[PDB]
Amino acid sequence: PHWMDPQLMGSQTTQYSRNRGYGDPIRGDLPIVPDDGGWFATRANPAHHLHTGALSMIGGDASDCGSTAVQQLIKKYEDKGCNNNGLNVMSSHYGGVM
Amino acid sequence: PHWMDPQLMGSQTTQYSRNRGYGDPIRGDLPIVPDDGGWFAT
Amino acid sequence: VTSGFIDLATYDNLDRALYGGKDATTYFIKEHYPVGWFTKLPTMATRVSGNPAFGQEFSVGVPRSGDYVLNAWLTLKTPEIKLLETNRLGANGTVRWTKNLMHNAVEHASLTFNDICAQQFNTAYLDAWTQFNMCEGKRIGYDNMIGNTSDMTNPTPAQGQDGARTLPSKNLVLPLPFFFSRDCGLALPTVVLPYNEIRINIKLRSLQELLVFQNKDTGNVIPISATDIAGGLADTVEAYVYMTVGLVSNVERCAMAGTVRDMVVEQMQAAPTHIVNPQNTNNVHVDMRFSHAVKALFFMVQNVTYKSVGSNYTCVTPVNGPGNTVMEPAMSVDPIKSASLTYENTTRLANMGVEYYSLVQPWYFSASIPVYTGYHMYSYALNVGSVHPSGSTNYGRLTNASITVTMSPESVVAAAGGGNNNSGYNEPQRFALVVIAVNHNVIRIMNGSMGFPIL
Amino acid sequence: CTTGAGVTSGFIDLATYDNLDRALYGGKDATTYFIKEHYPVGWFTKLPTMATRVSGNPAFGQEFSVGVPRSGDYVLNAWLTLKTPEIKLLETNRLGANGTVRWTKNLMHNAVEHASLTFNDICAQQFNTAYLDAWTQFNMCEGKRIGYDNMIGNTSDMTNPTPAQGQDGARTLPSKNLVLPLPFFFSRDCGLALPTVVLPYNEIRINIKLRSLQELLVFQNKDTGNVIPISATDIAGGLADTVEAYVYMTVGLVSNVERCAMAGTVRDMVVEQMQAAPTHIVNPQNTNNVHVDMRFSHAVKALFFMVQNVTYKSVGSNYTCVTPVNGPGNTVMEPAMSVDPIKSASLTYENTTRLANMGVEYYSLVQPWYFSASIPVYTGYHMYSYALNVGSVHPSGSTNYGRLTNASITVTMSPESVVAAAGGGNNNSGYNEPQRFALVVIAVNHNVIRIMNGSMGFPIL
Amino acid sequence: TCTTGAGVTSGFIDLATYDNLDRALYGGKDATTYFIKEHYPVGWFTKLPTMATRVSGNPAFGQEFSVGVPRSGDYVLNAWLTLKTPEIKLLETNRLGANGTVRWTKNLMHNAVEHASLTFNDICAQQFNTAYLDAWTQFNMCEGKRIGYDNMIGNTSDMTNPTPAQGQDGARTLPSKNLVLPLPFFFSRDCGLALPTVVLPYNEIRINIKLRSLQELLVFQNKDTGNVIPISATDIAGGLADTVEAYVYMTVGLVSNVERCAMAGTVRDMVVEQMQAAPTHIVNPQNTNNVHVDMRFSHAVKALFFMVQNVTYKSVGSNYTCVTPVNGPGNTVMEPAMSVDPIKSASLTYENTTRLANMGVEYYSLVQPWYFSASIPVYTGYHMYSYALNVGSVHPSGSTNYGRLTNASITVTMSPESVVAAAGGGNNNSGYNEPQRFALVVIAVNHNVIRIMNGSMGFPIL
Amino acid sequence: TVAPEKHGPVEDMNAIINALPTKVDAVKLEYSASKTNRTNKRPGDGGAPPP
């Protein structure tokens, strides 16, 4: 039964810095541990200095979605062994740099 | 002792599709089993 | 094209609170469910009593042998009008159909069960309902089917003048607002009511009260006569009733055969009219004595100077403007200035302005706002047109209730004549206050009979 | 005491409780207002895209196809934009001073005939001018009427006749682009949409055929009110067959968690198609009663019929026995003698009168008032529906004419039509020349489409 | 057969037409049927209008006044402001002399009302103003009520009709009739969302309204050249009464004692709609044709309304066309022939990644309202872009959050008509007889969550 | 600082609400009267036995 109840109840949202605006929208910034020191070391907080990225929703590789469940189907449905008529083909390589 | 008895009194004869009025009026059509399925089946 | 990924990436606590979740439904996928097999078709209504003619009441029996009757309308063939040169007003005379030709020539249309009156309505209820709950797009069509097409309402001079046009004889259609026509989910179970009798009575008005005979210059109205027009005032008229019936599948016909059915319906009840004289008093009290849980109240003052002209809720009668057309003088305002409700010396509703009832209440608790002066309403429910029950108070458990109405300076100055030519109030004017109420009720169907378990 | 802030007056209304109020309200599980239950919905986003044609170019009088692109997740919108050319009359017209040129009424819904949607190579869906006009007249949401009448022409800037350059009226018809939303099963409702991502094994194409500028522009005589075909010489700057038109569609992206679910599943969708009966030539001079036998296959839902004036190919979307003529103020007006030719109509199922000889006003007014969302504001456009709600995508009462045997419709002409069929009309009367009419019948039916194994097909054929 | 009057036998020849195609759509044990409406009881409640008590200020033109929401009402869901307009009588001693007319501005209401705010304690729950009012009333207008709304707020072809001086032919005076403006609030949007005053006995609700002076409310137009000059008290008879009566009315609801006892003492979550107005910007087509404006919004934005407003004369309002209206024949008001919206194209930018290309103006004008709104505007201007399927629906629909979105921008392109109208040189009764100026205004609508517990209200997320 | 207490109006409730069961008894009597059959289920009969 007193004032300031709504302001005590509310919780401020996360406020990022201007450095986050220069990040990569698609893929997030790499996890870098800041240097916690007392000599010319910035104590930057990754929570509001890092960009999470858009890859969380897009990337799969868990369910049938994602690339890692399409190459197997492609190889299974791809005909292999001689050609008889034509010039013969090689299966396309989809894995990227081992 | 209720209404709709005069019109539920009996049955009604079957009605044929437009496809029937095309075959031989002298000899019957060949007995062909129909196609039953869920993909482009009549 | 790729900005959708950026938009999707923005997922926060608020977005999780609103969207998301394992059980959250998704758009672009619609769940489909089967519906009952049925059909519908229109049918004629068999005449059973009298001959449809003006100034007489004729009766019709609702056809049996259907499964669900759900729609009713009446088609009337208007006669031909041909003004002559032997009229009493002479050259200074024009004849036109009254405003709102339909909703007129129909007095106290009634629907009765067996020999017990189910409900009825009249001109005031028709006008109020069609002015308050008129869905747009269909407004033009409804106007066209009821008249008002600049042909019936356009004054025509005598045959010897410039305007020799004759009013065309074209059929008109009036839908009948009934409890079964309110919604498709409410229809008469004719399959459940065998050998029962359903009666519909329509009392047409005399043709003398439907033709407006206006003077060209002084703007005066006198009753019409047979000798005024060619051919004569044909008393007989061609009137028909059509109703839509529906047939259901045999399985669902047999499933519900032999069971009790409870239905919620809406009806109307009108208080007796009271003549108000603004020249003597300014505030008038009217005692409202209703019975059941009322949903809405429609109250208005009607100018009743000339019986020929109807549906005129303005303090000044319309006159004949240029171009053989009808017009309203600049002094055309509703006579009501304020209104209030009282529960035996306990003012529930204060002396609110007329504009409140005219605009604010329809804006919030109605589907449309009236386009003509008058038509004051007050609703106890959130939605007037909704069939489902809403807020309502029953007057059965209420003692005497009163309504107070205050007149206007325009009304009090129009009550006395002396106006100039074509001013409308060239003669003293009479007004009558009319109040109607729309309420709820419950109907029970059992053993092929219809009754009110609690009324 | 009596004050304007009195709140306690409602306690009397609350206390007015009886058996009727107990039945209507209250209860252990009675719902209440002022408390809106909230449930989570799916997460998604939407954005518009341009469709790039890969076959032909948009030219007047020709047909071109556009491939619906993948890389979305749900296609639910489709509209076509087209930029009209600039029209300027010349004093060297063969009508001389008495010559006016104007765009036809309903510029759009014209120059678009037999617009079709196909998958892979299957003749899947199509619609045309009559269906477009009937649907827009019978299912028009109010408030958007002015928006549609600005989108598809009829803005009083293209339908107002303009005299030659030498005369007082020398204004040129404006060249502003116009947009038309193509009606399709996925565009009818948001519940139904194309699973383009789920269909990678089919090619989806939209085919649009345009009309000719001769069939579009109207060359009207100022005095006698006669319409003759336009020529390229009369129009200043020549006549250009090519035109700039584009196709846009709104696509919708969804999260991967629900994108994985839709992979590898069978779905059934309920769609609405149309069938257009071949037009029947009607001559009121000889016979005033016309019989037309329908031939429809699936579960029909509604039947829109009209009698179209066909005297001049330049003027279109006219369903009255008298053609509009030039009037005062450099405008177009419809003469006084203007009524729909149809007087009555009836249906018949094997010499059995299913529908009696109801008047024309019945189909014109009563049926739209009850079973549709709007009433047309023009003559003609007669409707008869087997369903309670025509515009509702959900199925309602309907009959399948394929299961039904042959059915017929009988229509009756009018004395105005029979006297306007012949010529003899004076100047600016409409029937100055003999008039010819044709009867067109359109039916709307339901159908089922099955999506499985990354492909779409009819489960019933 | 027989084609009888009560033909029912013909209704079986189509019922017999039952086969596989319709077997899926119709029939089944669970297949529901029409003609039988399911019934369910609802709550017991009553409603009645109540006068709202004032707490601060005095109702006068150009000043601010406050109104307190009364307690003891179980719910409140309505709010509307009634105001009696004064009487205007032009005098022959005016500066313009005989060639001068006075008329009320277009949309008298939605004018003289700005920064209308609803605040609990001293925290602004929400607020709106003239631009949002105009956009909402033009985009989400229900037909049938359009005439009533255009009658209650002016624009009745009587307040906006110019009146000459007494000595001229037109000696009519503007009538003094009261007008009503409903206040669009989150609790007024839907019946299911209403303020639980019974649950909130500690918070102090308040509504603040700031009016506008009559100087910018009255338009004083030159009859021949169509030039607008500010009005003065000596110009009209009776002076300029700064004070004027103005009342606020609201509708409250009462529920049953058992229901209120059951619902008393619990936590509730409510979803509301708010406003975010970007700061206005000045556009000069003579210098550059492309104008970029940055948006900095916080919550999940649902729709963006962007318009260009003519600001040549401070008296005239709600004029979104590059050329001002001028007096016309018959003592009426009409717009010149060259009267079109100045926006030619617009686009959106998310960190040099354009979400929308240089789409045409007609797209925003017609296609978006046709698909994702309940109405289409009938006036020039009023450009929108909505992320949601249905803007008018109170249930949440597709939207994006600007809190985690980096600074977005909107780019607009002018038109040659705007460029030529910016300079003067127009002839008499052309509207652009004087150089013209325009301004850019952007509005956004966003969702928010309000928590109701412990007898107090407040945003759980702030 | 305290929740307001809401009660009935100044005037007593009974004077307005009153109590008279005549309406409900009339409804019950009408329903009981209508319970008995009033229609004929033998149309085209002529239920007069031969003398």
* DSSP letters spanning E9-38: GGGSTTTT---HHHHHHB--TT-B-SS---
- What are the tokens at D300? 């029909």
Cβ atoms of E406 and E351 closer than 8 Å: yes
| Best CA proximity match to C369, nearest among C135, C124, C101 | C135
- Residue E309 bridge partners (DSSP): E439
Burial class (CB in 10 A: 0-12, 13-18, 19+), F1: exposed
Contact between chains at A58 and C5 (C-beta distance less than 8 A): yes
Residue F24 at interface with chain D, using a CB cutoff of 8 Å: yes
Task: Catalogue the long-range contacts made by C120-126 (C-beta closer than 8 Å, 24 or more residues apart).
Answer: C120/C268, C121/C177, C121/C268, C122/C270, C123/C310, C123/C311, C124/C270, C124/C298, C124/C300, C124/C302, C124/C434, C124/C436, C125/C268, C125/C270, C125/C298, C125/C436, C126/C177
Q: How far apart are CA C28 and CA D192, in angstroms?
A: 6
How far are the Cα atoms of C142, D80, D263 from residue D148, in angstroms, in the given order? 23, 14, 39
Q: How far apart are CA C48 and CA C200, in angstroms?
A: 10
- In the DSSP assignment, the letter for residue E69 is P
- How many other CB atoms are found less than 10 A from the CB of residue D305? 23
Alpha helix (H) ranges present in D194-297?
A: 213-216, 256-259
Cβ atoms of E277 and E433 closer than 8 Å: no
Cβ atoms of C396 and C292 closer than 8 Å: yes
- What are the tokens at D412? 């009756």
Contact between chains at F34 and C291 (C-beta distance less than 8 A): no
Residue C201 dihedral angles phi and psi, to the nearest 5°: -115, 130
DSSP strands (E only) in E317-427: 326-328, 332-334, 345-350, 356-360, 383-386, 400-401, 408-413
Q: How far apart are CA E220 and CA E100, in angstroms?
A: 7
Alpha helix (H) ranges present in C340-431?
A: 354-355, 361-365, 409-414
Burial F11-38 (b: 16+ CB within 10 A, else e): eeeeebeeeeeeeeeebeeeeeebeeee
Length of chain A: 98
- What are the tokens at C34? 């089967």
Q: How far apart are CA C434 and CA C286, in angstroms?
A: 10
Which residue type, as a one-letter code, is found at position C68? Y
Residues in Cβ contact with C54 at an 8 Å cutoff, skipping those fewer than 6 apart: C105, C204, C205, C206, C207, C210, C235, C236, C237
DSSP string computed for E251-308: EEEEE-HHHHHHHSS--EEEEEEEEEEPPPEEE-TTT-SEEEEEE---SEEEEEEEEE
Residue C198 dihedral angles phi and psi, to the nearest 5°: -120, 120
Length of chain F: 51
Residues in Cβ contact with E380 at an 8 Å cutoff, skipping those fewer than 6 apart: E320, E321, E339, E340, E341
Element (H, E) at A47: helix A46-49
Q: Computed over its alpha carbons, how large is the radius of gyration of chain E?
A: 27
Q: How far apart are CA D258 and CA C28, in angstroms?
A: 12
Residue C164 — left, alpha, or beta (φ > 0 → left; ψ -120 to 50 → alpha)?
alpha
- In the DSSP assignment, the letter for residue C113 is E
Map residue D445 onto helix, strand or coil: strand
Cβ atoms of D87 and D235 closer than 8 Å: yes
- How many other CB atoms are found less than 10 A from the CB of residue A14? 10
Q: Computed over its alpha carbons, how large is the radius of gyration of chain F?
A: 27
Contact between chains at B4 and C195 (C-beta distance less than 8 A): no
Contact between chains at C18 and E147 (C-beta distance less than 8 A): no
Map residue F20 onto helix, strand or coil: coil
DSSP string computed for D103-151: PPSSSBTBS-EEEEEEETTEEEEEE-HHHHHHHHHHSPPTTSHHHHHHH
Contact between chains at F39 and C344 (C-beta distance less than 8 A): no
Element (H, E) at D49: strand D44-51
Which residue type, as a one-letter code, is found at position C334? D
Q: How far apart are CA C45 and CA C39, in angstroms?
A: 19
Q: How far apart are CA E79 and CA C364, in angstroms?
A: 11
Cβ atoms of D177 and D107 closer than 8 Å: no
How far are the Cα atoms of A44, D186, E119 from residue D126, in angstroms, in the given order? 62, 14, 56
Q: How was this structure determined?
A: cryo-EM
- What are the tokens at D388? 């309670």
Burial D314-344 (b: 16+ CB within 10 A, else e): bbbbbbbbbbbbbeeebebebbeebbbbbbb
- Residue E326 bridge partners (DSSP): E334
Which residue type, as a one-letter code, is found at position E232? S
- Residue D64 bridge partners (DSSP): D208
| From C115, C195, C451, residue closest to F43, measured CB to CB | C195
- Residue C97 bridge partners (DSSP): C211
- Residue C173 bridge partners (DSSP): C75
How far are the Cα atoms of D94, D108, D257, E433 from residue D232, in angstroms, in the given order? 12, 22, 59, 41
- Residue C320 bridge partners (DSSP): C326
Which residues from B are below 8 Å from D when comparing CB atoms? 15-18, 38-42
Resolution stated for this PDB structure, in Å: 3.5
Length of chain D: 461
- In the DSSP assignment, the letter for residue F32 is H
D88 HSE (CA, 13 A, CB side): 9
- Looking at chain C, which subunits does it touch, using at least 3 CB pairs closer than 8 Å as the criterion? A, B, D, E, F
| From C135, C183, C247, residue closest to E37, measured CB to CB | C183
Alpha helix (H) ranges present in E329-389?
A: 361-362, 368-371
Residue A45 dihedral angles phi and psi, to the nearest 5°: -95, 115
Q: What's the farthest any 2 CA atoms get from each other in chain C?
A: 87
Residues in Cβ contact with E387 at an 8 Å cutoff, skipping those fewer than 6 apart: D45, D46, E301, E302, E303, E398, E399, E400
Cβ atoms of D58 and D156 closer than 8 Å: no
Burial class (CB in 10 A: 0-12, 13-18, 19+), D38: middle
What residue has token string 């009524």? D339
Q: How far apart are CA D152 and CA D84, in angstroms?
A: 11
What residue has token string 């003492």? E265
Contacts of D12 in chain F (CB under 8 A): 9, 13, 16-17
- What are the tokens at A59? 């990337």
- In the DSSP assignment, the letter for residue D364 is I
Map residue E374 onto helix, strand or coil: coil
Q: How far apart are CA C346 and CA E134, in angstroms?
A: 41
Residue C262 dihedral angles phi and psi, to the nearest 5°: -110, 130
| From C63, C367, C389, residue closest to E144, measured CB to CB | C367
| From D36, D144, D151, residue closest to E192, measured CB to CB | D36
Residues in Cβ contact with D291 at an 8 Å cutoff, skipping those fewer than 6 apart: D408, D409, D410
Residue C365 dihedral angles phi and psi, to the nearest 5°: -120, 45
Q: How far apart are CA C20 and CA D44, in angstroms?
A: 10
Alpha helix (H) ranges present in C330-440?
A: 354-355, 361-365, 409-414
* Distinct helix (H) and strand (E) counts, chain B: 0, 0
Q: How far apart are CA D117 and CA E379, in angstroms?
A: 35
- What are the tokens at E379? 């006036």
Map residue E425 onto helix, strand or coil: coil
Cβ atoms of E352 and E191 closer than 8 Å: no
Q: How far apart are CA A71 and CA E354, in angstroms?
A: 33
- In the DSSP assignment, the letter for residue D59 is B
Element (H, E) at C13: helix C13-18
Element (H, E) at E418: helix E416-422
Cβ atoms of C167 and C151 closer than 8 Å: yes
Q: How far apart are CA D407 and CA E17, in angstroms?
A: 13
| Distance spanning both ends of chain D, measured CA to CA | 78
- In the DSSP assignment, the letter for residue C423 is S
Which residues from C are below 8 Å from F when comparing CB atoms? 114-116, 194-197, 291, 343-344, 346, 396-399, 448-449, 451-455
Nearest CA distance, B38 vs chain E (angstrom):
11
Contacts of E26 in chain C (CB under 8 A): 34-37
- Residue C47 bridge partners (DSSP): C60
Q: How far apart are CA C426 and CA C221, in angstroms?
A: 11
Which residue type, as a one-letter code, is found at position D388? L
Cβ atoms of D19 and F24 closer than 8 Å: yes
Question: ∠ CA(C74), CA(C166), CA(C239), 5° rounding?
Answer: 15
Element (H, E) at E186: helix E186-189
| Best CA proximity match to D125, nearest among D206, D211, D209, D210 | D206
- What are the tokens at D434? 């003999």
| Distance spanning both ends of chain A, measured CA to CA | 65
Q: How far apart are CA D185 and CA E129, in angstroms?
A: 41
- In the DSSP assignment, the letter for residue D9 is T
Q: How far apart are CA C296 and CA C366, in angstroms?
A: 11
- How many other CB atoms are found less than 10 A from the CB of residue A44? 15
Q: How far apart are CA C366 and CA C348, in angstroms?
A: 21
DSSP string computed for C261-322: EEEEEEEEEEPPPEEE-TTT-SEEEEEE---SEEEEEEEEEEE-S-SSS-S--SSS--EEET
| Distance spanning both ends of chain C, measured CA to CA | 64
Q: How far apart are CA E313 and CA E439, in angstroms?
A: 12
- What are the tokens at E4? 């009888």
Map residue E148 onto helix, strand or coil: helix
Residue C251 at interface with chain A, using a CB cutoff of 8 Å: no
Distance of CA D266 to the CA centre of its chain: 32
| Best CA proximity match to E51, nearest among E64, E66, E65, E69 | E69
Residue E372 dihedral angles phi and psi, to the nearest 5°: -130, 45
DSSP string computed for C146-187: HS-SSSSSS-B--TTSS----B---EEEEE---HHHH-TT--
Contact between chains at C10 and E405 (C-beta distance less than 8 A): yes
Which residue type, as a one-letter code, is found at position D18? D
Contacts of D450 in chain B (CB under 8 A): 38-39
Residue E79 at interface with chain A, using a CB cutoff of 8 Å: no
| Distance spanning both ends of chain E, measured CA to CA | 74
Residues in Cβ contact with E304 at an 8 Å cutoff, skipping those fewer than 6 apart: E295, E384, E385, E386, E410, E442, E443, E444
Alpha helix (H) ranges present in chain F?
A: 13-17, 22-35
- Residue E103 bridge partners (DSSP): E219
- What are the tokens at D184? 């399709």
Q: How far apart are CA E422 and CA E427, in angstroms?
A: 14
Q: How far apart are CA C411 and CA C408, in angstroms?
A: 5
Q: How far apart are CA D433 and CA D224, in angstroms?
A: 10
Cβ atoms of D412 and D342 closer than 8 Å: yes
Contacts of D10 in chain F (CB under 8 A): none
- How many other CB atoms are found less than 10 A from the CB of residue D224? 17
- What are the tokens at D282? 């009607």
- How many other CB atoms are found less than 10 A from the CB of residue F3? 14
Burial E186-212 (b: 16+ CB within 10 A, else e): bbbebbbbbbbbbbbebbebbbbbbbb
- What are the tokens at D87? 């029209």
Residues in Cβ contact with D220 at an 8 Å cutoff, skipping those fewer than 6 apart: D100, D101, D102, D161, D226, D227, D325, D326, D332
DSSP strands (E only) in E74-167: 75-76, 80-84, 101-104, 114-120, 123-128
- What are the tokens at E411? 């780019």
Residues in Cβ contact with D201 at an 8 Å cutoff, skipping those fewer than 6 apart: D453, D454, D455
Length of chain B: 42
- How many other CB atoms are found less than 10 A from the CB of residue B4? 18
- What are the tokens at A42? 């910035």
Map residue C354 onto helix, strand or coil: helix
